[PDB]
Amino acid sequence: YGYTTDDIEFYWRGDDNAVTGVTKIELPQFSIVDYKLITKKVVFSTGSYPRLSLSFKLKRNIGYFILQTYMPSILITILSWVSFWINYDASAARVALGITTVLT
C-alpha cells in the first residue's frame, strides 16, 4: 500500500513451492483444477506498486445437480408423456396429467 516499486519488491520464495497445501484442499462442491502464481506491477495515480496474485481455477461438480434438479425434470416430462397412451375420451385425466406437470 504505502511503498511504491522503488521502495519494496515482492517475489515468491521458490516461485513454485511458495504456495503449498492446495492438493489437500477438499471442497464439498468444487474441485481445484490448478493454481497460478503471478508477479506484476500495478499503476495508480500515486505510483507503480508491486503485486502478486494467487489464482485458483475451481471446477464445479455435477453429481449433486443431476440427482437434485435434472432427474426430476426428466421424470416429470415422462409423466407428461404417459398422457398419450390414455384414450382421448377421458378429458379429465389427460388434462389432470398435463396441468400437474406444467405446475411442477
Binding site: 464439498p28 449433486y64 409423466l79 397412451w85 379429465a92
Partner: protein, 333 residues
C-alpha cells in the same frame, strides 16, 4: 505487604520476549483440559463448537522466589508481564476467549518457578465429516493445537495422565449425535518454518437416529403405501387413479428435496437420498403400471385383470424385501 515486594522482585530484570531456557533446552509444557460442553455439530459447515478450560503449566526459573508463602495466586492482571506460550488450535475456524466480567484467566506461580496458566475458550473446530451412511454414520473428529512460532526444538507439549476430563455429558447441545469417548495423541508435523509438536484430542460422535427417522423415513414409507392404495380402486375410474399417482409423485419429489436440503451439497450418493430415490422409483412404477393396465384394458381385459392382482402382491413384497436388505446392510456396515 510482602507479596508486593516478591512480585516486584520477580519483574525486575524480566524480559517477557524470551522463553525460559532460551538457549539451553526446549520448554516442556503440560496441557490439561476440561470440556464443558460440545456444541452443535452442524454438518452443513463441517464444524463443531466446543467449550473448554485450557490449562498450561511449565517451569520458569526466573519466577523463582524464596519466602514463607508457597504459591502466588493471581488474576489476569499479571498474565501480560511474564512469558506465555503461543498455543493455537490448528483446526479452529473461529475461537475466542471470554472477557466478562474480567478476562477469564488464572495465573499461579509456585515457589520453584512452576507456573500454571488457565483460560476459558470457545472453539469452533473444523472436521470434514464423511457424509456416507447418512444418517447411520459415526465420526471421530479432532481438536489439534500446537505452538505457532516455536518449533520442536524450543517448545514441547506433553499430556498429563488425567489430562482431558469431560463434564456431565447430559447438558450438552449434542442433539443428533452422542458422545462415546475420546483419546489424546501427540505427533510431529513439518511446516515451512520448522518441525512442530502437534497435540490432538479426538472426540468420538455417533449419530443417534430419531429426527431423520420421523422427518423423512416415515413420511416416505407412508407415501409408498399411499401409492399402493391405488391398486385396489377399480380400474374404470381413471381420473381418481391418475390423480393418486401424480400427486403422490409430487409429494415424493418435495420430500426428497427437503431431505437433501437437510445436509450440505455433496456430489456423492448417501444412504438417505438412496432411500428416497427407491421410494420415488416405487411410486413411478405403480403409476406406469396403472398406465399400462389402462392401455391394455382396451386391448385385452383379462391381461389387466390378472395384472392388477399380480401387482397387489408384487409391490408390498418387493418393498419389504428392499427395506430388509437396506436396513440390515447399513446396520452391519
Amino acid at each position: 505487604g510482602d507479596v508486593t515486594v516478591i512480585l516486584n522482585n520477580l519483574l525486575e530484570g524480566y524480559d517477557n520476549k524470551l522463553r525460559p531456557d532460551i538457549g539451553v533446552k526446549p520448554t516442556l509444557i503440560h496441557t490439561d483440559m476440561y470440556v464443558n460442553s460440545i456444541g452443535p455439530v452442524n454438518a452443513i459447515n463441517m464444524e463443531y463448537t466446543i467449550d473448554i478450560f485450557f490449562a498450561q503449566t511449565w517451569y520458569d526459573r526466573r519466577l523463582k522466589f524464596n519466602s514463607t508463602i508457597k504459591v502466588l495466586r493471581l488474576n489476569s492482571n499479571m498474565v501480560g508481564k511474564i512469558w506465555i506460550p503461543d498455543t493455537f488450535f490448528r483446526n479452529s475456524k473461529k475461537a475466542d476467549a471470554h472477557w466478562i466480567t474480567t478476562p477469564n484467566r488464572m495465573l499461579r506461580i509456585w515457589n520453584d518457578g512452576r507456573v500454571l496458566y488457565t483460560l476459558r475458550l470457545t472453539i469452533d473446530a473444523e472436521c470434514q465429516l464423511q457424509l456416507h451412511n447418512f444418517p447411520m454414520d459415526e465420526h471421530s473428529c479432532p481438536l489439534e493445537f500446537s505452538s505457532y512460532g516455536y518449533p520442536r526444538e524450543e517448545i514441547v507439549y506433553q499430556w498429563k495422565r488425567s489430562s482431558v476430563e469431560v463434564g456431565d455429558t447430559r447438558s450438552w447441545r449434542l442433539y443428533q449425535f452422542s458422545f462415546v469417548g475420546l483419546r489424546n495423541t501427540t505427533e510431529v508435523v513439518k511446516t515451512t518454518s520448522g518441525d512442530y509438536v502437534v497435540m490432538s484430542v479426538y472426540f468420538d460422535l455417533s449419530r443417534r437416529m430419531g429426527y431423520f427417522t420421523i422427518q423423512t423415513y416415515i413420511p416416505c414409507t407412508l407415501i409408498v403405501v399411499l401409492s399402493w392404495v391405488s391398486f385396489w380402486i377399480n380400474k374404470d375410474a381413471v381420473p381418481a387413479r391418475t390423480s393418486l399417482g401424480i400427486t403422490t409423485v409430487l409429494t415424493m419429489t418435495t420430500l426428497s428435496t427437503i431431505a437433501r436440503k437437510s445436509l450440505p451439497k455433496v456430489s456423492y450418493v448417501t444412504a438417505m437420498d438412496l432411500f428416497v430415490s427407491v421410494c420415488f422409483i416405487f411410486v413411478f412404477s405403480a403409476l406406469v403400471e396403472y398406465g399400462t393396465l389402462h392401455y391394455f384394458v382396451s386391448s385385452q381385459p383379462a391381461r389387466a385383470a390378472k395384472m392388477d392382482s399380480y401387482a397387489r402382491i408384487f409391490f408390498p413384497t418387493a418393498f419389504c424385501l428392499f427395506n430388509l436388505v437396506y436396513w440390515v446392510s447399513y446396520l452391519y456396515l
